[PDB]
A paper describes a structure:
The genome is replicated via a negative-sense RNA intermediate by 3Dpol, the viral RNA-dependent RNA polymerase (RdRP). For this, 3Dpol uses the viral protein 3B, in this context usually termed VPg (viral protein genome-linked), as a primer. Crystal structures have been reported of 3Dpol of the enteroviruses CVB3, PV, EV71, HRV1B, HRV14, and HRV16, and of the aphthovirus FMDV. Given its critical role in genome replication, 3Dpol is regarded as an attractive target for antiviral drugs.
Interestingly, the three virus pools each contained a single missense mutation compared to wild-type (wt) virus. These mutations were located either at nucleotide 7115 (A7115G) or 7127 (A7127G) resulting in amino acid changes M300V and I304V in the viral RdRP, 3Dpol, respectively. Markedly higher inhibition constants were observed for the two resistant mutants (M300V, 26.9 μM; I304V, 10.3 μM) as compared to that for the wt enzyme (1.3 μM). The apo structures of the EMCV M300V and I304V polymerase mutants were obtained using the same crystallization conditions as for the wt enzyme, yielding two different types of crystals for the mutants. Structural comparisons showed that the mutant polymerases were almost identical to the wt enzyme. The main differences were concentrated in helix α10, which contains the mutated residues, and in the preceding loop B. The side chains of residues 300 and 304 participate in a large hydrophobic cluster linking α10 with helices α2 (Y75), α6 (F194, A195, F199), α7 (I210) and α8 (L241, F255 and F256), included in the inner fingers. The substitutions of the methionine and isoleucine side chains by the shorter valine in the mutants imply a weakening of these hydrophobic interactions. This could result in an increased flexibility of α10, including the disruption of the last helical turn, and of the B-loop, which appears to have a key role in GPC-N114 binding in EMCV 3Dpol. In addition, the substitution with valine may disrupt the interaction of residue 300 with the compound.
Numbering used by the authors: 1 to 460
The structure:
């Protein structure tokens, strides 16, 4: 129903071969993670990755009850009271360069279709100084400006990454959707002003942690949450399903509305995300519902949706629930609920499952605990460790060991450099244990003290 097979087109190349290679650490740590299945003939699975990858799109939740509209409206009122309603569209130059609260558009990333077929890059289709598109791209943009997204095709392929061993064996490989470059430019034009503002004020008050640096913001987040009796963690991750098409409609008319300062065309842009045409080799699918991965605004949209959904679930579960009975901190599929009340998220899970949404605990368990505090929760694979008046993001051990066990040739040193800044919060003994396999074989890795100094100095 939600996945319609269109007529075939030309073959867009899809990578069937991982770029990931094992490090010296793999044989020591032996993680229950490995490169995702990219090929029909992978011996590590019995399933067909092409069938399994798209199975989530075969069914989609048609409708949502009235409570979702009510929560979206109220969440919108709180956001735009904080962020203001100056959310008009940016110019193409402004979109390319970016505003104070956001980076410029990456010129090295894929231009999308049909440019990848013709062997072109983003720098070929636009001049970055003048902000001038080539005749073909200018016509495409003007077409979209007339509310017509008819010939926008997302370049779709399998995501080359580490997955849990269970997902490898079931061929549960994630999908990447790359939109055309002019679709990305339009998207940043329409939502970039809001986004830059949204990503620069992460915290409990906004309800979002998007755009945070965990090194600094863990203290702010932690300090705001420590006064609450309880903090629960919620995971939205679900390979088998995607966002309802109805959710896009709610955001279009309750959140990203003209009354909240957005351009008239946003409704149509959001529709091009909700119902999208995707190219996967020769095959062409029309997919109803779901968020494309490669859209710059994806993680922001997912964060907002999931914030709305958890309160909707609470209203659906508890007749006497009120908006301010909890505080929410959302980041993509990860969510914290801070409250003084005792809440039963097993019951909330049952309520949300009636609307096609799955929630699980953020940790290993299969059931939600009745009691949960700040010290118990996991958020972006990190716990909250108190350090005087500060909080530090202590990353899960299995996560660190998995990251250290594989790499991409060429970028090893900068991967290890990033991991030192994650591993520092686990203490010197653990830090040295994690990097021991590398410097036993002669690799120089920054000392614990050098990286600990850097973090400490952030608050002096």
């Amino acid at each position: 129903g939600a996945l319609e097979r269109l007529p075939d087109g030309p073959r867009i190349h899809v990578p069937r071969k991982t770029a990931l290679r094992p490090t010296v650490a793999r044989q020591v740590f032996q993680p229950a993670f490995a490169p995702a299945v990219l090929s029909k003939f992978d011996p590590r699975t019995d399933a067909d990755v092409d069938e399994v990858a798209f199975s989530k799109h075969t069914s989609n939740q048609e409708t949502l009850p009235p409570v979702f509209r009510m929560v979206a409206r109220e969440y919108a009122n709180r956001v735009f009271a904080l962020l203001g309603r100056d959310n008009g569209r940016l110019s193409v130059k402004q979109a390319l360069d970016g505003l104070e609260g956001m980076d410029p558009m990456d010129k090295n990333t894929s231009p999308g279709l049909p440019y990848t077929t013709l062997g072109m890059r983003r720098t070929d289709v636009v001049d970055w100084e003048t902000a001038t598109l080539i005749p073909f791209a200018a016509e495409r943009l003007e077409k979209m400006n007339n509310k017509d997204f008819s010939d926008i095709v997302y370049q779709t392929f399998l995501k080359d990454e580490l997955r849990p061993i269970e997902k490898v064996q079931a061929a549960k490989t994630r999908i990447v959707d790359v939109p055309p470059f002019e679709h990305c430019i339009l998207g940043r034009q329409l939502l970039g002003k809001f986004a830059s503002k949204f990503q620069t004020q992460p915290g409990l008050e906004l309800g979002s942690a998007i755009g945070c640096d965990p090194d600094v913001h863990w203290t702010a987040f932690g300090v705001a949450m420590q006064g609450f009796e309880r903090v629960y963690d919620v995971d939205y991750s679900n390979f088998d399903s995607t966002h309802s098409v109805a959710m896009f409609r709610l955001l279009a008319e309750e959140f990203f509305s003209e009354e909240n300062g957005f351009d008239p065309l946003v409704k149509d842009y959001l529709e091009s995300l909700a119902i999208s045409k995707h190219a996967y080799e020769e095959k062409r699918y029309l997919i109803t519902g779901g968020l494309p991965s490669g859209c710059a605004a994806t993680s922001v949209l997912n964060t907002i949706m999931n914030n709305i959904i958890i309160r909707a679930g609470l209203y659906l579960t508890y007749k006497n629930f009120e908006f301010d009975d909890v505080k929410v901190l959302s980041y993509g599929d990860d969510l914290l609920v801070a409250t003084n009340y005792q809440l039963n998220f097993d019951r909330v899970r049952t309520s949300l499952a009636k609307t096609g949404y799955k929630i699980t605990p953020a940790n290993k368990t299969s059931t939600f605990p009745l009691e949960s505090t700040l010290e118990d929760v996991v958020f972006l694979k990190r716990k909250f460790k108190k350090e005087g008046p500060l909080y530090r993001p202590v990353m899960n051990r299995e996560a660190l060991e998995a990251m250290l066990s594989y790499y991409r040739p060429g970028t090893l040193s900068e991967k290890l450099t990033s991991i030192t800044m994650l591993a520092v919060h686990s203490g010197k003994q653990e830090y040295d244990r994690l990097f021991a396999p590398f410097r036993e074989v002669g690799v120089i890795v920054p000392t614990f003290e050098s990286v600990e100094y850097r973090w400490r100095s952030l608050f002096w």
